[PDB]
Design a protein around this ligand. Structure first.
Ligand SMILES: O=C(O)CNC(=O)C(=O)O
Ligand SMILES: [Mn+2]
Lengths: 13, 429
């Protein structure tokens, strides 16, 4: 999953 | 404290000490050959093997090579294959393997290592926790939840396990359930609980349940250096960038891009409407749990600076228009997308992941009333053919209470004060 609009993922990178 | 020498290694402690000393002196060049010599002489010595692995590690730092580090990763496992390996040394060698495997992005491989560590040390809670992280880094929230559940059954007070359990719960939209775990977990003060992520999500979960203590945690999170400010709570940041909720075109320097969007806004609209009519499947619902209610879908042309070829076949002129502007098409921490929101929609207050982008909104179809967007302490409305610019790393909130749909065009640009080099190197989001 990707963080597009928010910060939902444990890591975005 | 940690005993690393087995029966045999104790009989060669001198040579082993001799070699290690060279490594500590920074002379990582001849320390390798030294441990390589001991490995050749004592091919079953764990400490000699671990020595070799550690020097290879440092050499990977000096040289900045992935192959030599990849080599060290194997040497670290080699240690575990040898006989009569002391527990402390066994744990150390495999932990560092995982660490570096995660550094290289071998998350799948780092998992098997962590599973092995938990199998070898079934009583070590901290390893179960690290295993949990292993699952989280591959997006396996289901298995991560099991792990932290397994941990809390035995250790209800482990704060690390609590924040992470709370994090998983909130990501599952178990908002109320998540709060005590996130809160108690941070308050525990255990190592690894002072993370911006848990501050960020505790406060958001609090906001959603109408708990006015939310900004008390945003404030604390800011005081501990996680948030640039209480309003701006992005976590992937380049410190120093001009921070303000609302920007004017002139302020961004991207005046040509704005002109182009506003001059050609009708073809942008029409191609979006055409997709709505004849290809509504290209519009995907927002899938980040940012909605309290309503319908919100997005049709994406660019993400992570990569063009979606099939999508652009639905908006060919629009994509052709934007190819002229690398400040947006090359923004690897932003998107270009149509965004449609229907009446009865409310988007929770939220923040984007990075301060490295500014967000442009071109009004395409804006009902006369009902649609508004708050960024920080100021609310604004869209106009058809007009560009709004805001920094979505600041808290912002959206409403749609019109009597028909609202369509906009979203264009992300690199933060203007980012140097060309920064724009080249920053990992994508
Ligand atoms: O697209 C919309 O209607 C709302 N957009 C946002 O909240 C955003 O761009 O970050
Ligand atoms: Mn947003």
């Amino acid at each position: 999953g990707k963080c597009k609009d928010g910060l939902g993922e444990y890591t975005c990178t | 404290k940690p005993k690393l020498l087995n029966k045999f290694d104790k009989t060669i402690k001198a040579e082993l000490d001799a070699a290690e000393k060279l490594r500590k002196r920074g002379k990582i060049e001849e320390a390798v050959n030294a441990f390589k010599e001991l490995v050749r002489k004592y091919p079953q010595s764990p400490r000699a093997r671990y020595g070799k692995a550690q020097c290879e590690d440092d050499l990977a730092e000096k040289r900045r090579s992935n192959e030599v580090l990849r080599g060290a990763i194997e040497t670290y496992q080699e240690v575990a294959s040898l006989p009569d390996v002391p527990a402390d040394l066994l744990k150390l060698s495999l932990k560092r393997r995982s660490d570096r495997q995660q550094f290289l992005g071998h998350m799948r491989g780092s998992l098997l290592t962590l599973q092995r560590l938990v199998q070898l040390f079934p009583n070590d809670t901290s390893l179960k926790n690290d295993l949990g992280v292993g699952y989280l880094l591959i997006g396996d929230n289901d298995n991560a939840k099991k792990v932290y559940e397994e941990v809390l059954s035995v250790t209800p007070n482990d704060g690390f396990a609590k924040v992470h359990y709370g994090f998983i719960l909130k990501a599952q939209n178990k908002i109320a359930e998540s709060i005590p775990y996130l809160k108690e977990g941070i308050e525990s003060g255990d190592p690894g609980t002072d993370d911006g992520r848990f501050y960020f999500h505790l406060g958001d979960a609090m906001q959603r349940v109408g708990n006015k203590e939310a900004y008390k945690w945003y404030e604390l999170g800011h005081k501990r250096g996680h948030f640039a400010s209480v309003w701006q709570r992005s976590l992937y940041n380049v410190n120093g960038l001009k921070a303000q909720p609302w920007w004017t075109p002139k302020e961004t320097g991207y005046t040509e891009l704005v002109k182009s969007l506003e001059r050609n806004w009708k073809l942008i609209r029409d191609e979006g409407l055409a997709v709505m009519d004849k290809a509504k499947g290209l519009f995907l619902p927002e899938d980040e749990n940012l909605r309290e209610k309503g319908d919100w879908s997005q049709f994406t042309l660019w993400q992570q600076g990569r063009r979606n070829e099939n999508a652009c076949k639905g908006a060919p002129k629009t994509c052709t228009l934007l190819e002229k502007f690398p400040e947006t098409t090359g923004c690897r921490r932003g998107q270009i997308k149509y965004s449609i929101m229907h009446p009865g929609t409310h988007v929770w207050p939220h923040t984007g992941p990075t301060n490295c982008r500014l967000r442009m909104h071109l009004g395409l179809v804006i009902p006369k009333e009902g649609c508004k967007i708050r960024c920080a302490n100021e609310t604004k409305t869209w106009e058809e053919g007009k560009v709004l610019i805001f920094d979505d790393s600041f808290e912002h909130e959206v409403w749609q209470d019109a009597s028909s749909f609202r369509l906009i065009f979203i264009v992300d640009v690199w933060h203007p004060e980012l140097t060309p080099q920064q724009r080249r190197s920053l990992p994508a989001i």
